[PDB]
Amino acid sequence: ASGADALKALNKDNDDSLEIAEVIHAGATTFTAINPDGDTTLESGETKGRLTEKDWARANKDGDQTLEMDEWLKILRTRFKRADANKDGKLTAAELDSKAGQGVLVMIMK
Amino acid sequence: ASGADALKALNKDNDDSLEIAEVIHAGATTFTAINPDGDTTLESGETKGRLTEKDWARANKDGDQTLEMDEWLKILRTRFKRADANKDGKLTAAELDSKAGQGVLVMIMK
Ligand SMILES: [Dy+3]
Ligand SMILES: [Dy+3]
Ligand SMILES: [Dy+3]
Ligand SMILES: [Dy+3]
Ligand SMILES: [Dy+3]
Ligand SMILES: [Dy+3]
Ligand SMILES: [Dy+3]
């Protein structure tokens, strides 16, 4: 998916950008959408192609093999900062289409 | 409620315990249940009696006046650890009934 696609689906206010509240909420929706096994936890197989082993090492600090909702969203907030090249707390289409923005996109859209 | 009543509410027996995945999932449901204004954000008036000013200062690091889901759940994970007096990763009824356990209960049930 592209940045224009994400704005079309996830932006409901009268702007051209995704703010952190919009991004976190879409991350929470996506967590459930990519979790087909009927639990409340993401296992490593469920996160392939969206998260790296380094993301798990950084965010999963509780000794389990499960990403709970908060550990997933922690990674997303870090990725938001990396994509927000002009520091204004808003992700525009150009920021979403950048390499760092692609990392946000894979956590906010199935 | 009490620890026993909280365990019963989550379809568990009186001598059972809560682990972090069930607690985080219940915290995520509670976030939305205590948020009656149609947004995706908890304002301070929505968290009175559940969170302190110091909780907001620790968890709300983004310069806004709003708790997103990840900031709320960060506080819950901190409270789980404080209520887990023996640090075994499980909260018994007695741990839930403690003063620190009360702080978990106000975040996992309306
Ligand atoms: Dy917006
Ligand atoms: Dy799963
Ligand atoms: Dy975990
Ligand atoms: Dy920006
Ligand atoms: Dy609200
Ligand atoms: Dy915030
Ligand atoms: Dy314990």
Numbering used by the authors:
A (entry chain A), B (entry chain B): 24 to 133
Q: Could you pull the original sentences from the published paper?
A:
The natural lanthanide-binding protein lanmodulin (LanM)4,5 is a sustainable alternative to conventional solvent-extraction-based separation. Second, adjacent EF hands in LanMs are separated by 12–13 residues—rather than the typical ≈25 residues in CaII-responsive EF-hand proteins—resulting in an unusual three-helix bundle architecture with the metal-binding sites on the periphery.
The structure of DyIII–Hans-LanM confirms the importance of second-sphere control of ligand positioning. The rearrangement of this second-sphere hydrogen-bonding network suggests a structural basis for RE-dependent differences in Kdimer values. By contrast, even though DyIII induces the same overall response as LaIII in stoichiometric titrations, in the chelator-buffered DyIII titrations Hans-LanM exhibits a lesser conformational response (1.8-fold increase). The main response to DyIII occurs at 2.6 nM, >30-fold higher than with the LREs, and with little or no cooperativity (n = 1.3).
